[PDB]
């Protein structure tokens, strides 16, 4: 396979900071290294997303082909995640709930209104 | 030492693994969890891995959207013997084995979920 | 006898083939056309085929839409030696080689077009 | 990798017949075998498409997840293709033209308004 998820923000500078603080993401790579952000790769703890500016020339050759509005992230500890987001006063759309199909999850909007869903042996044959 | 992994979503991974092993002759490498219904399985094709996942439970971060039919492309050495096994197993043949411009010998089969598999004699 | 084929679109297939052979150690199996710039190339990974295509020229019938970045998943036997070659070639490392829950050793690299490649020590 | 292209029609019966006659497609598989069409696979001469009803229960488990409105088909003989479509009086959106990037193509709408685009050595190393 599938697409890399890419997110477009009016200003990625504040978005990167907001996502790291509220959602506990970590910055892996940023471009340019110094100054205003044109591109950044963030570890969500359930995979990486690309964040970019709405418009401009793109730094990545295959970028700008799609833009995601609703992201699904699988997280190890969803309660602690839920606790950090609400303590920061994020726009919770749906409070943390057990779903009678073996999942617990919540919905939340980020600082620019994009919807995020956060949700929670081996036998090798030979 | 390298293996390309192709991720495919199935409604019933238990039945999909069984089907894929029986019909295509893939080999189960790994299943998760150990007990009960499979949520995730890795299958060796002999040249690449098929990662079977339950619908709605992708391998990594994803954008929200529907379960769609995938086209899978496979090169095989003996496409005639391959077609004969697929047919004997009762698979749904979409395009029967035929010659195509150049040296191509290929056929097309739909799996139990509806994914399309194209098997070609090394193109 | 089987080989899974993974199709990937590149703006400059000539440079992509060169890059992929040099950086990842893939092997050129086939190029089309014979003379001039490559429009299509097949690359052997040792366990699966990468089909390089020019952007806007897909392998088969398609729905209209943009050129997007793909995530490619690869299992490797010696991920340490693999990471050392990628780095020496100057590839853009997104996630440096690290241990992850279970027995996982993986890293992530972006290719010249921007596709993401995840290399893991047999998961 | 990519999706199979699936097309939804108000009545697939007429659509299948129309596509075979005007666009020169060939029916590979139909469901059910007898009676009204719920599902059909058509060879376009540049790959296969799935055609189905708008709604209903689906016969294919992975179907109904997407629906394509604009299809791109690569054809060996685009002039003959163009000639057959116009002789049948299909809604040509864009007449057959050489494009200064090495391609010749035309745009055309089908009987239910979906947009179709029709467009036109080996060295093994080892």
XYZ file of C-alpha atoms in Angstrom:
498
model
C 1.661 -3.258 -0.983
C 0.000 0.000 0.000
C 0.621 3.749 -0.041
C 2.736 5.642 2.441
C 0.350 7.869 4.415
C 1.036 11.552 3.743
C -0.586 14.440 5.593
C -0.792 18.038 4.381
C -0.741 20.978 6.821
C -0.973 24.775 6.327
C 2.133 25.010 8.517
C 4.051 21.745 9.238
C 6.242 23.525 11.825
C 3.434 23.716 14.392
C 1.968 20.374 13.237
C 5.241 18.482 13.840
C 5.574 20.026 17.327
C 1.892 19.371 18.123
C 2.002 15.716 16.969
C 5.176 15.008 18.988
C 3.753 16.649 22.137
C 0.096 15.510 22.079
C 0.240 12.169 20.186
C 3.738 11.212 21.416
C 5.116 10.849 17.886
C 8.864 11.176 17.282
C 10.629 13.054 14.498
C 12.877 10.765 12.436
C 13.772 13.094 9.569
C 13.098 16.687 8.589
C 13.703 18.766 5.445
C 15.334 21.143 5.254
C 17.456 20.364 8.340
C 17.491 24.062 9.285
C 14.523 26.465 9.084
C 10.902 26.028 7.977
C 9.677 22.460 7.316
C 8.931 21.348 3.754
C 8.899 17.628 4.654
C 9.122 15.446 7.774
C 8.891 11.737 8.622
C 7.271 10.877 11.940
C 7.205 7.595 13.823
C 3.665 7.080 15.154
C 4.668 3.982 17.133
C 2.666 1.923 14.626
C 4.476 2.994 11.459
C 5.705 6.187 9.841
C 3.778 9.039 8.230
C 4.977 11.820 5.927
C 3.949 15.378 6.781
C 4.145 18.187 4.226
C 2.976 21.666 3.194
C -0.315 22.155 1.348
C 1.137 23.123 -2.057
C 4.710 24.276 -2.832
C 7.282 22.257 -4.803
C 7.666 18.781 -3.239
C 10.983 17.370 -2.001
C 9.907 13.775 -2.713
C 9.396 12.707 -6.352
C 6.431 10.385 -5.661
C 4.749 12.825 -3.211
C 1.613 14.910 -3.884
C -0.340 12.047 -5.503
C -2.667 11.495 -2.541
C -3.531 13.138 0.801
C -5.038 11.259 3.774
C -7.797 12.770 5.922
C -8.409 9.806 8.255
C -5.460 7.841 9.674
C -5.639 4.515 11.561
C -2.765 3.806 13.971
C -2.327 0.585 15.969
C -0.755 1.324 19.364
C 0.526 -0.928 22.192
C -0.831 1.158 25.088
C -4.012 2.992 24.025
C -5.073 4.095 27.550
C -1.831 5.988 28.217
C -2.162 7.406 24.680
C -5.757 8.456 25.388
C -4.617 9.987 28.721
C -1.882 12.131 27.111
C -4.169 13.487 24.352
C -7.001 14.532 26.705
C -4.565 16.074 29.232
C -3.396 18.274 26.351
C -7.051 19.127 25.593
C -7.197 17.617 22.097
C -10.548 17.554 20.261
C -11.790 14.077 21.256
C -14.496 13.027 18.780
C -15.189 9.653 20.433
C -14.160 8.739 24.091
C -12.026 5.611 24.765
C -14.376 2.592 24.420
C -14.194 -1.185 24.253
C -15.654 -2.482 21.024
C -17.406 -5.893 21.234
C -15.050 -7.224 18.530
C -11.913 -7.398 20.700
C -10.666 -3.840 20.207
C -10.325 -0.672 22.264
C -9.964 2.659 20.575
C -10.820 6.324 20.391
C -11.215 9.000 17.700
C -9.531 12.420 17.895
C -8.948 15.440 15.655
C -5.507 17.070 15.382
C -4.674 20.812 15.425
C -5.805 21.220 11.790
C -8.862 18.917 11.909
C -7.528 15.627 10.474
C -9.164 12.538 12.015
C -6.991 9.985 13.818
C -8.126 6.569 15.065
C -5.924 4.940 17.717
C -6.622 1.238 18.371
C -5.264 -1.826 20.188
C 2.577 -16.131 20.177
C 4.473 -17.141 17.051
C 4.605 -20.626 15.560
C 7.080 -21.068 12.715
C 6.327 -24.113 10.546
C 9.516 -26.198 10.332
C 19.009 -13.894 1.431
C 16.300 -11.383 0.460
C 12.524 -11.983 0.283
C 9.929 -9.535 -1.111
C 6.753 -9.551 1.006
C 3.305 -9.092 -0.567
C 0.559 -8.211 1.945
C -2.992 -9.436 1.179
C -6.150 -9.021 3.283
C -8.590 -11.944 3.860
C -11.919 -12.174 5.684
C -11.063 -15.695 6.896
C -7.271 -16.175 7.211
C -7.728 -19.809 8.423
C -9.491 -20.757 5.188
C -7.246 -18.563 3.022
C -4.026 -20.189 4.302
C -5.502 -23.667 3.729
C -6.741 -22.695 0.261
C -3.427 -21.058 -0.780
C -1.324 -24.012 0.420
C -3.648 -26.597 -1.210
C -4.337 -24.804 -4.515
C -1.082 -22.900 -5.212
C 1.329 -25.093 -3.230
C 2.598 -22.285 -0.994
C 4.227 -23.277 2.284
C 3.159 -22.042 5.724
C 6.155 -20.363 7.366
C 4.535 -18.656 10.362
C 1.153 -18.166 12.008
C -0.047 -15.780 14.740
C -1.420 -16.337 17.308
C -0.383 -19.901 18.230
C -3.831 -21.072 19.354
C -7.241 -20.440 17.783
C -8.053 -18.629 14.562
C -5.190 -17.175 12.536
C -4.961 -13.374 12.364
C -1.642 -13.319 10.517
C 0.303 -15.870 8.491
C 3.417 -15.777 6.307
C 3.509 -18.046 3.267
C 6.584 -18.937 1.200
C 6.026 -19.084 -2.565
C 9.584 -20.191 -3.363
C 10.331 -16.665 -4.616
C 8.691 -14.134 -2.309
C 6.452 -14.158 0.764
C 2.672 -13.733 0.934
C 1.623 -12.081 4.186
C -1.977 -13.050 4.929
C -3.778 -10.568 7.205
C -7.315 -10.365 8.521
C -9.387 -7.655 6.854
C -9.313 -4.503 9.001
C -5.967 -5.409 10.631
C -3.197 -4.082 8.335
C 0.550 -4.592 8.852
C 1.276 -0.902 9.495
C -0.211 2.630 9.682
C -2.920 3.127 7.055
C -5.459 5.524 5.576
C -9.137 4.683 6.171
C -10.842 2.982 3.214
C -12.545 -0.141 1.873
C -11.425 -3.729 1.314
C -10.625 -3.944 -2.440
C -9.706 -6.793 -4.804
C -5.959 -7.000 -5.582
C -4.164 -8.224 -8.689
C -1.213 -10.427 -7.847
C 1.494 -11.151 -10.428
C 3.477 -14.415 -10.282
C 6.085 -15.894 -12.676
C 6.212 -19.719 -12.744
C 8.565 -22.206 -14.459
C 6.033 -24.921 -15.381
C 2.786 -23.004 -16.015
C 1.102 -26.078 -17.538
C 1.516 -28.204 -14.402
C 0.533 -25.173 -12.329
C -2.721 -24.706 -14.301
C -3.522 -28.433 -14.019
C -3.231 -28.327 -10.193
C -5.341 -25.143 -9.925
C -8.076 -26.740 -12.072
C -8.055 -30.089 -10.198
C -8.509 -28.122 -6.957
C -11.633 -26.410 -8.376
C -10.241 -22.843 -8.423
C -12.231 -20.240 -10.407
C -10.380 -19.779 -13.702
C -10.941 -16.300 -15.174
C -8.625 -16.699 -18.189
C -7.752 -20.242 -19.320
C -4.110 -21.083 -20.124
C -3.143 -19.545 -23.470
C -0.318 -18.197 -25.640
C 0.042 -14.418 -25.924
C 2.211 -12.180 -28.204
C 5.938 -12.766 -27.590
C 6.707 -16.048 -25.770
C 4.024 -15.592 -23.096
C 2.092 -18.472 -21.561
C -0.257 -17.246 -18.831
C -3.582 -17.790 -17.088
C -5.688 -15.945 -14.516
C -7.443 -17.325 -11.440
C -9.603 -15.745 -8.760
C -8.926 -16.941 -5.189
C -11.554 -17.614 -2.453
C -11.640 -13.917 -1.407
C -11.748 -12.599 -4.987
C -8.152 -11.510 -5.474
C -6.872 -12.053 -9.034
C -3.722 -14.065 -9.580
C -1.895 -13.956 -12.895
C 0.540 -16.816 -13.477
C 2.953 -16.440 -16.400
C 5.738 -18.664 -17.749
C 8.600 -16.295 -16.772
C 7.021 -13.647 -19.072
C 9.816 -22.223 -9.702
C 7.517 -19.378 -8.603
C 8.374 -15.656 -8.351
C 6.140 -12.940 -6.834
C 6.320 -9.719 -8.874
C 6.132 -6.289 -7.207
C 5.378 -3.427 -9.629
C 6.857 0.014 -8.810
C 6.606 3.245 -10.827
C 9.671 5.498 -11.420
C 10.082 8.851 -13.169
C 13.507 7.792 -14.490
C 13.723 3.986 -14.908
C 17.349 4.230 -16.202
C 18.491 5.843 -12.951
C 16.204 3.695 -10.783
C 17.578 0.407 -12.182
C 21.160 1.633 -11.663
C 20.357 2.844 -8.142
C 18.525 -0.378 -7.140
C 21.302 -2.643 -8.465
C 24.076 -0.538 -6.846
C 22.413 0.183 -3.481
C 20.311 -2.955 -2.814
C 22.289 -5.455 -4.908
C 19.349 -6.476 -7.101
C 20.150 -8.083 -10.442
C 18.908 -6.847 -13.822
C 16.992 -9.682 -15.492
C 15.327 -7.874 -18.404
C 15.027 -4.427 -19.955
C 12.663 -3.000 -22.596
C 13.249 -1.602 -25.144
C 16.712 -2.850 -26.181
C 18.085 0.539 -27.252
C 17.721 3.942 -25.584
C 16.047 4.791 -22.299
C 14.453 1.980 -20.305
C 10.650 2.001 -20.042
C 10.416 -1.353 -18.274
C 12.878 -3.515 -16.361
C 12.628 -6.671 -14.251
C 14.957 -6.992 -11.273
C 15.689 -10.172 -9.303
C 15.963 -9.721 -5.532
C 16.847 -13.365 -4.847
C 13.310 -13.907 -3.523
C 10.840 -12.043 -5.724
C 10.941 -9.733 -8.742
C 10.768 -5.929 -8.810
C 9.112 -4.690 -11.993
C 10.304 -1.144 -12.674
C 7.895 0.876 -14.843
C 7.899 4.451 -16.068
C 5.376 6.656 -14.283
C 2.175 6.848 -16.349
C 2.815 3.492 -18.081
C 1.359 0.758 -15.820
C 1.604 -2.999 -16.440
C -2.141 -3.462 -17.005
C -5.569 -1.737 -17.066
C -5.819 0.930 -14.363
C -8.003 3.585 -12.762
C -6.931 7.213 -13.290
C -5.049 8.724 -10.338
C -1.787 10.180 -9.037
C 1.730 8.809 -8.597
C 1.980 7.900 -4.870
C 4.816 6.733 -2.603
C 4.790 2.962 -1.920
C 5.964 1.010 1.111
C 7.942 -2.058 0.143
C 8.544 -4.873 2.638
C 11.662 -7.065 2.361
C 13.019 -9.826 4.654
C 16.828 -10.210 4.620
C 19.191 -12.767 6.214
C 22.091 -10.446 7.127
C 20.413 -7.096 7.888
C 23.629 -5.660 9.371
C 25.647 -6.135 6.173
C 22.640 -4.898 4.202
C 22.441 -1.672 6.263
C 26.205 -1.115 5.905
C 25.988 -1.300 2.077
C 22.948 1.024 1.941
C 24.777 3.590 4.111
C 28.071 3.393 2.152
C 26.062 4.060 -1.026
C 24.599 7.254 0.511
C 20.948 6.103 0.617
C 18.533 8.211 2.714
C 18.028 6.311 5.974
C 14.631 7.065 7.547
C 14.945 4.651 10.495
C 18.447 3.515 11.514
C 19.060 -0.195 12.208
C 17.540 -1.142 15.568
C 16.058 -3.925 17.704
C 12.271 -4.040 18.076
C 9.948 -6.112 20.360
C 10.266 -9.853 19.642
C 13.444 -10.792 17.721
C 13.107 -8.017 15.125
C 16.072 -6.243 13.563
C 14.943 -3.748 10.922
C 15.667 -0.424 9.246
C 13.907 1.866 6.773
C 15.328 3.603 3.706
C 13.834 5.932 1.119
C 14.896 5.268 -2.496
C 15.678 7.914 -5.184
C 11.971 8.274 -6.133
C 10.749 8.378 -2.519
C 9.433 4.851 -2.091
C 9.973 3.447 1.423
C 11.781 0.157 1.841
C 11.629 -1.743 5.114
C 14.332 -4.377 5.563
C 13.864 -6.834 8.436
C 15.927 -9.794 9.661
C 13.348 -12.466 8.677
C 10.868 -10.774 11.081
C 0.434 -4.271 -6.602
C -2.728 -2.371 -7.462
C -6.508 -2.742 -7.339
C -8.598 -4.662 -9.823
C -10.706 -2.082 -11.681
C -14.410 -2.538 -10.931
C -17.226 -0.680 -12.667
C -20.771 -0.266 -11.360
C -23.765 -0.058 -13.723
C -27.526 0.414 -13.127
C -28.021 -2.612 -15.384
C -24.911 -4.724 -16.234
C -26.896 -6.724 -18.826
C -26.959 -3.845 -21.320
C -23.499 -2.636 -20.216
C -21.847 -6.011 -20.946
C -23.493 -6.151 -24.398
C -22.611 -2.501 -25.123
C -18.945 -2.885 -24.066
C -18.501 -6.047 -26.178
C -20.117 -4.437 -29.249
C -18.734 -0.867 -29.132
C -15.365 -1.282 -27.329
C -14.676 -4.803 -28.667
C -14.322 -6.293 -25.181
C -14.886 -10.024 -24.659
C -16.811 -11.731 -21.872
C -14.631 -14.178 -19.922
C -16.945 -14.990 -17.019
C -20.460 -14.102 -15.932
C -22.499 -14.648 -12.751
C -24.975 -16.121 -12.538
C -24.415 -18.210 -15.693
C -28.129 -17.974 -16.544
C -30.321 -14.859 -16.210
C -29.614 -11.304 -15.028
C -25.957 -10.337 -14.430
C -24.712 -9.758 -10.881
C -21.021 -9.952 -11.874
C -18.935 -10.240 -15.054
C -15.240 -10.235 -15.991
C -14.353 -8.592 -19.290
C -11.120 -8.697 -21.254
C -10.400 -5.166 -22.513
C -7.424 -6.323 -24.594
C -5.175 -4.528 -22.094
C -6.290 -6.343 -18.944
C -9.518 -7.397 -17.275
C -12.195 -5.325 -15.545
C -14.995 -6.395 -13.202
C -18.495 -5.111 -13.939
C -21.249 -5.184 -11.318
C -24.615 -3.812 -10.171
C -24.837 -0.544 -8.234
C -25.819 -2.015 -4.841
C -27.191 -5.522 -4.123
C -25.304 -8.273 -2.266
C -21.900 -8.847 -3.927
C -20.745 -12.218 -5.280
C -17.070 -11.403 -4.635
C -15.883 -11.058 -1.013
C -13.384 -8.238 -1.692
C -15.762 -6.334 -4.038
C -17.616 -3.084 -3.237
C -14.589 -1.369 -1.645
C -13.953 0.991 -4.564
C -15.613 2.048 -7.841
C -13.709 3.502 -10.825
C -15.082 6.410 -12.866
C -12.140 6.881 -15.260
C -10.413 3.846 -16.798
C -7.128 3.851 -18.765
C -6.673 0.998 -21.261
C -3.536 0.398 -23.350
C -4.461 -1.034 -26.762
C -2.369 -2.389 -29.676
C -4.427 -0.823 -32.485
C -6.017 2.445 -31.299
C -7.131 3.667 -34.769
C -9.253 0.577 -35.464
C -10.561 0.911 -31.885
C -11.382 4.585 -32.480
C -13.066 3.636 -35.799
C -15.350 1.010 -34.200
C -16.483 3.311 -31.354
C -17.390 6.265 -33.610
C -19.153 4.003 -36.155
C -21.358 2.910 -33.247
C -21.944 6.594 -32.380
C -20.344 6.549 -28.921
C -20.012 9.840 -27.008
C -16.484 10.872 -28.062
C -15.195 13.437 -25.549
C -11.822 13.946 -27.271
C -11.067 12.953 -30.975
C -8.107 10.632 -31.780
C -4.929 12.766 -31.456
C -1.171 12.329 -31.390
C 0.298 13.615 -28.162
C 3.814 15.141 -28.417
C 5.048 12.632 -25.805
C 4.959 9.548 -28.053
C 1.337 8.528 -27.499
C -1.895 8.452 -29.482
C -5.202 8.272 -27.717
C -8.795 9.365 -27.419
C -11.373 9.869 -24.652
C -14.902 8.423 -24.799
C -17.900 7.985 -22.498
C -19.752 4.655 -22.265
C -23.541 4.075 -22.233
C -23.785 5.137 -18.562
C -21.284 8.036 -18.667
C -18.059 6.448 -17.349
C -14.904 7.913 -18.929
C -12.547 5.622 -20.848
C -9.094 6.558 -22.155
C -7.680 4.321 -24.900
C -3.956 4.786 -25.632
C -1.035 3.274 -27.558
C 12.705 -5.502 -28.101
C 13.659 -7.541 -25.049
C 17.163 -7.943 -23.651
C 17.505 -10.513 -20.878
C 20.645 -10.021 -18.770
C 22.514 -13.347 -18.686
